[PDB]
Amino acid sequence: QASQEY
Amino acid sequence: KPTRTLVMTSMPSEKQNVVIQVVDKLKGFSIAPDVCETTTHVLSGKPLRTLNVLLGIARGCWVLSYDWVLWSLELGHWISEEPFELSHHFPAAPLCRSECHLSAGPYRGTLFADQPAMFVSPASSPPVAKLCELVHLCGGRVSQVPRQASIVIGPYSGKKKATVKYLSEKWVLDSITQHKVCAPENYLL
């Protein structure tokens, strides 16, 4: 799973 | 035992394997799961504004393309970072890195040095402690309670006060990324 984009 | 860490962010697993292998061959870094006080280099697989990119800018790290690792492996040594900076996506990255490198003593940004104290909602996204860290590292002042602040960042269920700006977390992040204090009007809650 990916690190959240902000 | 290297005193600096490198962090991967938005990195597909097969690229992480390569970075890990390259660091095993060229040495010079430990790999850390997330940006911390020892971090000098942040490697992004896709130029997404992740928390690690943000923290990377706030600390004045190299925020680099994955290709830096590929070239370094080919030449058998860690090469100059400048050509691989992700400045198009994150204009503040090379700016904060330049200033960090000039610093005598621990580096601290000044982007927020003329802002009043800010209270960060405990319900914020990105999470409160990290968002406070970002505000502090970029030269801002962090309040522990809402009465202390003229600026309140994120979800807030207290009674609103007339001379306080209630802004989304994005105000902080867009400011950091551009190295401009963004206009509050566009970020009002």
Side-chain angles (χ1 to χ4, degrees):
Chain A
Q1 293 177 335
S3 291
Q4 175 72 255
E5 181 177 24
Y6 293 96
Chain B
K1 182 58 179 197
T3 53
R4 59 186 184 172
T5 53
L6 175 148
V7 175
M8 295 165 302
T9 185
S10 301
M11 199 57 82
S13 204
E14 327 83 50
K15 287 188 181 177
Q16 289 184 219
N17 287 323
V18 171
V19 173
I20 290 163
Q21 272 145 22
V22 175
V23 167
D24 197 39
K25 298 185 165 131
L26 298 189
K27 313 288 189 205
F29 293 94
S30 300
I31 294 171
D34 298 280
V35 170
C36 68
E37 64 192 344
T38 58
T39 299
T40 50
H41 288 66
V42 180
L43 283 160
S44 180
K46 294 172 160 183
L48 294 180
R49 189 172 66 179
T50 56
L51 182 58
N52 280 317
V53 165
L54 287 158
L55 284 172
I57 297 164
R59 294 191 180 277
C61 299
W62 296 108
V63 173
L64 306 178
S65 185
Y66 171 66
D67 294 2
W68 180 68
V69 164
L70 301 171
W71 276 98
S72 299
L73 176 71
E74 295 311 300
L75 300 187
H77 69 281
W78 294 120
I79 61 159
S80 303
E81 296 83 350
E82 284 97 325
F84 302 95
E85 286 188 283
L86 297 174
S87 56
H88 175 79
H89 297 279
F90 315 116
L95 189 45
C96 297
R97 176 270 304 160
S98 181
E99 291 290 332
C100 176
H101 290 198
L102 284 171
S103 181
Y107 160 78
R108 202 183 159 205
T110 59
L111 173 66
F112 292 134
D114 296 326
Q115 295 308 113
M118 313 189 192
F119 175 72
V120 175
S121 175
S124 66
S125 182
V128 61
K130 296 273 106 192
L131 183 48
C132 288
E133 173 172 17
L134 282 168
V135 169
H136 166 74
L137 288 166
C138 296
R141 250 172 313 275
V142 176
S143 307
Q144 291 72 48
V145 297
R147 63 154 139 75
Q148 263 187 292
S150 309
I151 296 167
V152 170
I153 301 304
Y156 185 63
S157 64
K159 277 138 200 156
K160 287 185 201 157
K161 316 272 191 297
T163 55
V164 175
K165 289 157 187 186
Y166 296 90
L167 315 176
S168 69
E169 306 93 314
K170 268 186 137 275
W171 175 77
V172 180
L173 312 181
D174 287 357
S175 298
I176 293 177
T177 311
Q178 192 69 223
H179 203 75
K180 285 291 191 165
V181 186
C182 288
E185 282 186 328
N186 314 317
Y187 297 89
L188 302 165
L189 303 174

mmCIF file of all heavy atoms in Angstrom, chain B residues 89-111:
data_model
loop_
_atom_site.group_PDB
_atom_site.id
_atom_site.type_symbol
_atom_site.label_atom_id
_atom_site.label_comp_id
_atom_site.label_asym_id
_atom_site.label_seq_id
_atom_site.Cartn_x
_atom_site.Cartn_y
_atom_site.Cartn_z
ATOM 1 N N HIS B 89 8.246 19.657 -8.900
ATOM 2 C CA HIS B 89 7.090 19.270 -8.111
ATOM 3 C C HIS B 89 7.049 19.962 -6.760
ATOM 4 O O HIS B 89 5.974 20.218 -6.253
ATOM 5 C CB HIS B 89 7.061 17.742 -7.944
ATOM 6 C CG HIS B 89 6.905 17.025 -9.246
ATOM 7 N ND1 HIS B 89 5.680 16.866 -9.863
ATOM 8 C CD2 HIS B 89 7.826 16.483 -10.082
ATOM 9 C CE1 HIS B 89 5.853 16.241 -11.014
ATOM 10 N NE2 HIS B 89 7.143 15.994 -11.169
ATOM 11 N N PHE B 90 8.230 20.233 -6.190
ATOM 12 C CA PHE B 90 8.380 20.758 -4.843
ATOM 13 C C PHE B 90 9.398 21.877 -4.867
ATOM 14 O O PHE B 90 10.589 21.671 -4.526
ATOM 15 C CB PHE B 90 8.847 19.633 -3.873
ATOM 16 C CG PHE B 90 8.093 18.334 -4.059
ATOM 17 C CD1 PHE B 90 8.760 17.177 -4.486
ATOM 18 C CD2 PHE B 90 6.726 18.263 -3.784
ATOM 19 C CE1 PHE B 90 8.071 15.981 -4.662
ATOM 20 C CE2 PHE B 90 6.011 17.046 -3.962
ATOM 21 C CZ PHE B 90 6.692 15.908 -4.397
ATOM 22 N N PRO B 91 8.947 23.094 -5.237
ATOM 23 C CA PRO B 91 9.914 24.204 -5.469
ATOM 24 C C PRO B 91 10.712 24.600 -4.251
ATOM 25 O O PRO B 91 11.903 24.979 -4.358
ATOM 26 C CB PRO B 91 9.006 25.344 -5.990
ATOM 27 C CG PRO B 91 7.881 24.640 -6.612
ATOM 28 C CD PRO B 91 7.592 23.465 -5.688
ATOM 29 N N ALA B 92 10.125 24.427 -3.072
ATOM 30 C CA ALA B 92 10.839 24.692 -1.821
ATOM 31 C C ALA B 92 11.982 23.711 -1.521
ATOM 32 O O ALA B 92 12.934 24.052 -0.812
ATOM 33 C CB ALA B 92 9.852 24.725 -0.645
ATOM 34 N N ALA B 93 11.919 22.507 -2.081
ATOM 35 C CA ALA B 93 12.959 21.488 -1.766
ATOM 36 C C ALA B 93 14.389 22.016 -2.001
ATOM 37 O O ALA B 93 15.207 22.042 -1.079
ATOM 38 C CB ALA B 93 12.683 20.154 -2.526
ATOM 39 N N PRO B 94 14.679 22.540 -3.211
ATOM 40 C CA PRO B 94 16.081 22.936 -3.328
ATOM 41 C C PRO B 94 16.362 24.171 -2.541
ATOM 42 O O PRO B 94 17.480 24.399 -2.150
ATOM 43 C CB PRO B 94 16.261 23.192 -4.850
ATOM 44 C CG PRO B 94 14.954 23.438 -5.348
ATOM 45 C CD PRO B 94 14.006 22.563 -4.518
ATOM 46 N N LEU B 95 15.319 24.944 -2.259
ATOM 47 C CA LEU B 95 15.506 26.189 -1.527
ATOM 48 C C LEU B 95 15.862 25.875 -0.075
ATOM 49 O O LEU B 95 16.861 26.347 0.464
ATOM 50 C CB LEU B 95 14.229 27.060 -1.660
ATOM 51 C CG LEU B 95 14.324 28.496 -1.118
ATOM 52 C CD1 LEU B 95 15.616 29.068 -1.593
ATOM 53 C CD2 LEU B 95 13.162 29.309 -1.701
ATOM 54 N N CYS B 96 15.053 25.056 0.573
ATOM 55 C CA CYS B 96 15.371 24.654 1.935
ATOM 56 C C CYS B 96 16.668 23.843 2.057
ATOM 57 O O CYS B 96 17.403 23.989 3.033
ATOM 58 C CB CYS B 96 14.199 23.886 2.539
ATOM 59 S SG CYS B 96 12.738 24.904 2.660
ATOM 60 N N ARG B 97 16.962 23.000 1.083
ATOM 61 C CA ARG B 97 18.233 22.253 1.110
ATOM 62 C C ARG B 97 19.435 23.228 1.052
ATOM 63 O O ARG B 97 20.409 23.120 1.845
ATOM 64 C CB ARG B 97 18.271 21.279 -0.052
ATOM 65 C CG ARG B 97 19.608 20.483 -0.225
ATOM 66 C CD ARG B 97 20.591 21.227 -1.146
ATOM 67 N NE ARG B 97 20.040 21.530 -2.474
ATOM 68 C CZ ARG B 97 20.525 22.485 -3.295
ATOM 69 N NH1 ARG B 97 21.542 23.264 -2.926
ATOM 70 N NH2 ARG B 97 19.989 22.670 -4.495
ATOM 71 N N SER B 98 19.373 24.182 0.120
ATOM 72 C CA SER B 98 20.436 25.219 0.064
ATOM 73 C C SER B 98 20.645 25.920 1.415
ATOM 74 O O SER B 98 21.763 26.078 1.877
ATOM 75 C CB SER B 98 20.108 26.259 -1.037
ATOM 76 O OG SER B 98 21.121 27.248 -1.124
ATOM 77 N N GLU B 99 19.563 26.347 2.063
ATOM 78 C CA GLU B 99 19.679 27.027 3.339
ATOM 79 C C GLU B 99 20.173 26.104 4.477
ATOM 80 O O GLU B 99 20.957 26.531 5.349
ATOM 81 C CB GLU B 99 18.326 27.661 3.720
ATOM 82 C CG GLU B 99 17.902 28.879 2.813
ATOM 83 C CD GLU B 99 18.781 30.141 3.056
ATOM 84 O OE1 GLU B 99 19.310 30.319 4.185
ATOM 85 O OE2 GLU B 99 18.966 30.956 2.115
ATOM 86 N N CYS B 100 19.698 24.859 4.497
ATOM 87 C CA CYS B 100 20.180 23.903 5.482
ATOM 88 C C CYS B 100 21.699 23.737 5.329
ATOM 89 O O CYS B 100 22.426 23.772 6.300
ATOM 90 C CB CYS B 100 19.469 22.548 5.312
ATOM 91 S SG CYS B 100 20.113 21.302 6.444
ATOM 92 N N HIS B 101 22.176 23.572 4.098
ATOM 93 C CA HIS B 101 23.613 23.387 3.882
ATOM 94 C C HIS B 101 24.443 24.598 4.325
ATOM 95 O O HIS B 101 25.539 24.424 4.824
ATOM 96 C CB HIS B 101 23.884 22.967 2.440
ATOM 97 C CG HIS B 101 23.418 21.570 2.144
ATOM 98 N ND1 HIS B 101 23.850 20.851 1.057
ATOM 99 C CD2 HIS B 101 22.576 20.750 2.823
ATOM 100 C CE1 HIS B 101 23.291 19.653 1.074
ATOM 101 N NE2 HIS B 101 22.506 19.571 2.130
ATOM 102 N N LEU B 102 23.876 25.805 4.233
ATOM 103 C CA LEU B 102 24.551 27.030 4.714
ATOM 104 C C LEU B 102 24.553 27.214 6.229
ATOM 105 O O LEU B 102 25.288 28.057 6.757
ATOM 106 C CB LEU B 102 23.932 28.286 4.087
ATOM 107 C CG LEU B 102 24.229 28.669 2.640
ATOM 108 C CD1 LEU B 102 23.294 29.816 2.271
ATOM 109 C CD2 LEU B 102 25.710 29.066 2.443
ATOM 110 N N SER B 103 23.740 26.437 6.933
ATOM 111 C CA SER B 103 23.514 26.677 8.352
ATOM 112 C C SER B 103 24.711 26.268 9.229
ATOM 113 O O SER B 103 25.289 25.191 9.052
ATOM 114 C CB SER B 103 22.225 25.974 8.799
ATOM 115 O OG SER B 103 21.977 26.201 10.171
ATOM 116 N N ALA B 104 25.092 27.161 10.144
ATOM 117 C CA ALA B 104 26.000 26.825 11.246
ATOM 118 C C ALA B 104 25.115 26.541 12.459
ATOM 119 O O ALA B 104 24.347 27.407 12.898
ATOM 120 C CB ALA B 104 26.953 27.977 11.535
ATOM 121 N N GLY B 105 25.187 25.323 12.982
ATOM 122 C CA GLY B 105 24.238 24.910 14.009
ATOM 123 C C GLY B 105 23.008 24.311 13.353
ATOM 124 O O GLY B 105 22.793 24.495 12.140
ATOM 125 N N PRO B 106 22.196 23.577 14.136
ATOM 126 C CA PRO B 106 20.984 22.917 13.617
ATOM 127 C C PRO B 106 20.129 23.857 12.770
ATOM 128 O O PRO B 106 20.003 25.036 13.079
ATOM 129 C CB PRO B 106 20.244 22.481 14.890
ATOM 130 C CG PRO B 106 21.375 22.201 15.870
ATOM 131 C CD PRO B 106 22.418 23.275 15.568
ATOM 132 N N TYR B 107 19.586 23.324 11.685
ATOM 133 C CA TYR B 107 18.877 24.143 10.719
ATOM 134 C C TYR B 107 17.411 24.196 11.103
ATOM 135 O O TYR B 107 16.797 23.208 11.563
ATOM 136 C CB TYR B 107 19.067 23.627 9.295
ATOM 137 C CG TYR B 107 18.011 24.101 8.327
ATOM 138 C CD1 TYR B 107 18.054 25.399 7.807
ATOM 139 C CD2 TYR B 107 16.951 23.256 7.953
ATOM 140 C CE1 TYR B 107 17.085 25.847 6.937
ATOM 141 C CE2 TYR B 107 15.981 23.678 7.087
ATOM 142 C CZ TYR B 107 16.053 24.990 6.579
ATOM 143 O OH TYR B 107 15.093 25.427 5.726
ATOM 144 N N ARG B 108 16.868 25.378 10.932
ATOM 145 C CA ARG B 108 15.477 25.595 11.178
ATOM 146 C C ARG B 108 14.980 26.597 10.165
ATOM 147 O O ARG B 108 15.595 27.635 9.995
ATOM 148 C CB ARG B 108 15.281 26.121 12.587
ATOM 149 C CG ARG B 108 13.900 25.876 13.054
ATOM 150 C CD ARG B 108 13.627 26.436 14.406
ATOM 151 N NE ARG B 108 12.184 26.565 14.488
ATOM 152 C CZ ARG B 108 11.535 27.419 15.265
ATOM 153 N NH1 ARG B 108 12.203 28.238 16.081
ATOM 154 N NH2 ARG B 108 10.215 27.430 15.228
ATOM 155 N N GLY B 109 13.882 26.284 9.483
ATOM 156 C CA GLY B 109 13.363 27.177 8.436
ATOM 157 C C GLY B 109 12.846 28.488 9.028
ATOM 158 O O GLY B 109 12.729 28.624 10.233
ATOM 159 N N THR B 110 12.536 29.459 8.180
ATOM 160 C CA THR B 110 11.977 30.712 8.675
ATOM 161 C C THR B 110 10.717 31.076 7.911
ATOM 162 O O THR B 110 10.173 32.128 8.124
ATOM 163 C CB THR B 110 12.973 31.867 8.514
ATOM 164 O OG1 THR B 110 13.284 31.986 7.126
ATOM 165 C CG2 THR B 110 14.255 31.610 9.283
ATOM 166 N N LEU B 111 10.257 30.204 7.005
ATOM 167 C CA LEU B 111 9.014 30.439 6.282
ATOM 168 C C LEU B 111 7.891 30.983 7.189
ATOM 169 O O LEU B 111 7.173 31.900 6.783
ATOM 170 C CB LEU B 111 8.534 29.152 5.592
ATOM 171 C CG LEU B 111 7.153 29.175 4.911
ATOM 172 C CD1 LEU B 111 7.130 30.127 3.716
ATOM 173 C CD2 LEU B 111 6.742 27.760 4.427
#
